[PDB]
Design a protein around this nucleic acid. Structure first.
Ligand SMILES: [Mg+2]
Ligand SMILES: [Mg+2]
Ligand SMILES: [Mg+2]
Ligand SMILES: [Zn+2]
Lengths: 563, 38, 131, 141
RNA sequence: AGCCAGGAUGUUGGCUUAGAAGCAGCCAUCAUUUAAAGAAAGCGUAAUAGCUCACUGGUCGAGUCGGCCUGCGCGGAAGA
């Protein structure tokens, strides 16, 4: 398209297609003239130049005699078209090498065959803005693109798979099968399910089985579509794309069919969101309405997910881009109206001891005569190492001096959990603490456990202050691919940030870079990456082990509340 | 450019030229070393 | 530091080693490689000897003044870069072989490796006896 | 055709072949994979450095294979395994920068005189002597 | 001054050891290997390739290079 725009060259675009994408392309319609004097196109089969008329809006055109300005390159590419079409069967090539010109019908059929097996792509030229080329591309859609029964049938699995479970020829007689490719939002009914009937017939009011989830759905209003507009139709035949009102539970990519039809279809894969944002409405108490809006927009779109992380109150918004994610917020402002501003996510820190070990203890004068008991514990805090266990709590029982009563000796580890689980420093959990009980004191009458847990807590507190332990940031394993020309820029950007690097690896179609970066930094990293790489890079997060980092924010989150 | 009253050669590729009497610094490496008047 | 006294001295200090030992070499400055040429001049210093003065102060006038006392063909201008590798045990030794083998590979060019011959009339190498 | 062609000093000296993970992702230009990482180096990484530093030249070839006359056993490893103290510069004016004696020099001379040679076998011995002595501290012998 | 070009293959340095790269931090380390090797010049400095700190050989025919003092000038120097 845009053959009218300056710099236009059909040949260069064809060569770019061959060199970059990988397909070998056969020209179908060349172009007469330069960008401004784009009269029309010349087909390489009928040998006619369909110059379009400027006065009317492309509806009419006039056929000419393909002038001598391009009568040699045209013949050359026409011959290349013949030769390329002849690579469909030996009967074509044998007559082609026999010196006789093949008839147009067999050329078109052989091309349709080559498009069907996807060996070649047929390239047509034209400019929609200049009202030219569109009729010829639609014509080549009729002549070359495949109809539903112009390929073999779709396959599936039945009862955990079979040799040939389903080969459903698209017909009006076989039992109903379909796929719900798209879900849309209607404020007046609450859903809009787009489906393509691969093989079968279904009608208004007919019940269906959602094979994957094994449940019943009634088709209330099957309709056909003209963009936003909807037109009621009584029935949908096989091979037709329609929208189903009255579906309330079907996720994108779920097969909808009558019973005894293929349970699972191939449409089982979706991408992973790269951009993660937080959002919070101006009035904080619109949270239920916002949550409902997010839940609907997440059920319709499988690549947009909303999970409310339970460490904080923030709602986490994941998406494919900053555009994507802000269209998902102004759309909320306009339909299902809520006003919400996006921001940054908060910080999930942890802690590790800075290689300090002692034998600290705690003691409260709980006796006072009347109370009747008291508790004391001698503990020994130590770290193990940053990242050897999944269970950070390590406890090797060793109680020797003052051995406590024998019914809850191993039960003096779960009581320590309520300090390690959350919040000792600034409301952030701790990892790797090891306790090792050697001494203490008690009296074997009724040694109160809940007030013995106070001694352990004050012991942990004292150990913390004398330890001078430091904060641990979250750092993940990003992996990026890019062409071997932007390696310098990507590695420079990670180096500008406080990012480590790991792997000098080069693929065959690029390079896989591996880097360890913080989580408080690199907010909106994907969009910056696309900017500095010409939108040709992806990444992933593997949530690897935390690493130490010099942070001026690590203490600012606890000196905000002081002591 | 720079119209500072004290032009100097900030790097090695700067040259001192005296076009129109005015003493100028012209740098054939990076244009941030272009000054006007001695 | 190619001053007048240092040149007048090093001219004789480099003519002496080639008038007491074997012929010397010369290697131009066209295209040297990082290891292909550096380790070739390494092997040259290895086989030829550890006393060769691979430096070059072979100006035409300095040569005609200093070196031309004996074997006056050296006085002829050496219009190329020069790396001198003499040879201890006889004439036309491993150094001459390395120079002749460097004129076509493993160096820029060896300026045909003409060398110094006491007779100065034998174009052929010192293999006169057919045997 | 062209020897090596990519000269990047981003490879852990000896030890595990192709130790990219420690070396860092900043020299990704080179096209090394699991094919050229265990062809020749895997079978001749024994008599050079058994627990010591021996940098290796890849010598990648444009002939669609990888093989060349690889470098002989390093002197960096000779003077780090015959010494005991593997220290050096950085803390060379404060404590031991490693040991260097005539025994390590003779070892490297009789060992690294295959391919890592210079203007003499004794000249590569002086190379090992410089690589052992100029660390900042040398044993007295 | 102008032109024909050459600086490691013990050397991810023996290295702040996850190298920070024959020219990041860095310690110092001619490191024979020399028309050259400084473990540091702008390119990628985190790195190759191809121009190259520095340095010289070959060309090429009379002056050249920087400082110090002094005279007289130049810019700094825009108002009703
Ligand atoms: Mg003045
Ligand atoms: Mg003035
Ligand atoms: Mg003014
Ligand atoms: Zn400048």
């Amino acid at each position: 398209n845009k053959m009218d725009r300056m710099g236009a060259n059909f040949l260069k675009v064809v060569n770019q297609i061959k060199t970059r994408l990988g397909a070998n392309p056969v020209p179908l319609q060349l172009a007469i003239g330069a960008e401004e004097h784009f009269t029309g196109v010349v087909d390489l089969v009928k040998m006619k130049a369909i110059n379009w008329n400027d006065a009317d809006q492309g509806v009419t055109f006039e056929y000419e005699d393909i002038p001598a300005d391009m009568v040699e390159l045209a013949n050359e590419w026409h011959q290349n078209l013949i030769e390329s079409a002849a690579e469909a069967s030996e009967e074509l090539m044998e007559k082609y090498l026999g010196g006789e010109e093949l008839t147009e019908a067999e050329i078109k059929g052989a091309l349709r065959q080559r498009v069907l097996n996807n060996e070649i792509i047929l390239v047509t030229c034209g400019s929609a803005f200049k009202n030219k080329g569109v009729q010829a591309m639609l014509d080549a859609v009729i002549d070359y693109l495949p109809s539903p029964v112009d390929v073999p049938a779709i396959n599936g699995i039945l009862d955990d798979g079979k040799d040939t479970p389903a080969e459903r020829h698209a017909s009006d007689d076989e039992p109903f099968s379909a796929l719900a490719f798209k879900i849309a939002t209607d404020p007046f009914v609450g859903n809009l399910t787009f489906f393509r009937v691969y093989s079968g017939v279904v009608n208004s009011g007919d019940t269906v089985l959602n094979s994957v989830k094994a449940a019943r759905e009634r088709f209330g209003r099957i309709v056909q579509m003209h963009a936003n507009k909807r037109e009621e139709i009584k029935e949908v035949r096989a091979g037709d794309i329609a929208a189903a009102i009255g579906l309330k539970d079907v996720t994108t990519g779920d097969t909808l069919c009558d019973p005894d039809a293929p349970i699972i279809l191939e449409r089982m894969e979706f991408p992973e969101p790269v951009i993660s944002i937080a959002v919070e409405p101006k009035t904080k108490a619109d949270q239920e309405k916002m949550g409902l809006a997010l839940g609907r927009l997440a059920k319709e779109d499988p690549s947009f997910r909303v999970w409310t992380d339970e460490e904080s109150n923030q709602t986490i918004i994941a998406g494919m881009g900053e555009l994507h994610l802000d269209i998902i917020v102004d759309r909320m402002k306009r339909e299902f109206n809520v006003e919400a501003n996006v921001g940054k996510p908060q910080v999930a820190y942890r802690e590790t001891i800075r290689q300090k070990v002692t034998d600290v203890e705690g003691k409260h004068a709980k006796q006072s005569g009347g109370r009747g008991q008291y508790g004391h514990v001698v503990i020994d805090m130590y770290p193990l190492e940053p990242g050897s266990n999944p269970k950070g709590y390590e406890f090797i029982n060793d109680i020797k001096g003052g051995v406590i009563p024998g019914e809850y000796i191993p039960a003096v580890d779960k009581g320590i959990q309520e300090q390690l689980k959350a919040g000792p420093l600034a409301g952030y959990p701790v990892v790797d603490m090891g306790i090792r009980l050697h001494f203490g004191s008690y009296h074997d009458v009724d040694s109160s456990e809940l007030a013995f847990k106070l001694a352990a807590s004050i012991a942990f507190k004292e150990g913390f202050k004398k330890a001078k332990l430091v904060l641990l940031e979250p750092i993940m394993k990003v992996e990026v691919e890019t062409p071997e020309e932007n390696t310098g820029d990507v590695i420079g950007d990670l180096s500008r940030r406080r990012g480590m690097l790991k792997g000098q690896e080069s693929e065959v179609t690029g390079v896989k870079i591996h880097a360890e970066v913080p989580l408080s930094e690199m907010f909106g990293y994907a969009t910056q990456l696309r900017s500095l790489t010409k939108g040709r890079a992806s990444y992933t997060m593997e949530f690897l082990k935390y690493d130490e980092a010099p942070s001026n924010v690590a203490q600012a989150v606890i000196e905000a509340r002081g002591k | 450019m720079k119209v500072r009253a004290s032009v100097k050669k900030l790097c090695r590729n700067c040259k001192i030229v005296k076009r129109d009497g005015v003493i100028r610094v012209i740098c054939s490496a990076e244009p941030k070393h272009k000054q006007r008047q001695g | 530091m190619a001053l007048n006294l240092q040149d007048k001295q090093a001219i004789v200090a480099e003519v002496s080693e080639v008038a007491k030992g074997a012929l010397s070499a010369v290697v131009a400055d066209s295209r040297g490689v990082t290891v292909d040429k550096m380790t070739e001049l390494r092997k040259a210093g290895r086989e030829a000897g550890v006393y060769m003065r691979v430096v070059r102060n072979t100006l035409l006038r300095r040569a005609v003044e200093g070196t031309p006392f004996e074997c006056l063909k050296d006085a002829f201008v050496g219009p190329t870069l020069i790396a001198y590798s003499m040879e201890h045990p006889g004439a036309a030794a491993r150094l001459f072989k390395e120079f002749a083998k460097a004129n076509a590979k493993f160096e820029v060019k060896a300026a045909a490796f003409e060398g110094e011959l006491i007779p100065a009339s034998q174009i052929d190498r010192l293999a006169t006896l057919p045997t | 055709a062209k020897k090596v062609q990519a000269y990047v000093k981003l490879q852990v000296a000896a030890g595990m072949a192709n130790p990219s993970p420690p070396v860092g992702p900043a020299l990704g230009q080179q096209g090394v994979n699991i094919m050229e990482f265990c062809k020749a180096f895997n079978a001749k990484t024994d008599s050079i450095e058994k627990g010591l530093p021996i940098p290796v030249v890849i010598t990648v070839y444009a002939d669609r294979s990888f093989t060349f006359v690889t470098k002989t056993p390093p002197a960096a490893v000779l003077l780090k395994k015959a010494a005991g103290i593997k220290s050096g510069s950085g803390k060379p004016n404060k404590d031991k920068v490693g040991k260097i004696s005539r025994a390590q020099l003779q070892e490297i001379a009789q060992t690294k005189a295959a391919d890592m040679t210079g203007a003499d076998i004794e000249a590569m011995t002086r190379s090992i002597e410089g690589t052992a002595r100029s660390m900042g501290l040398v044993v007295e012998d």
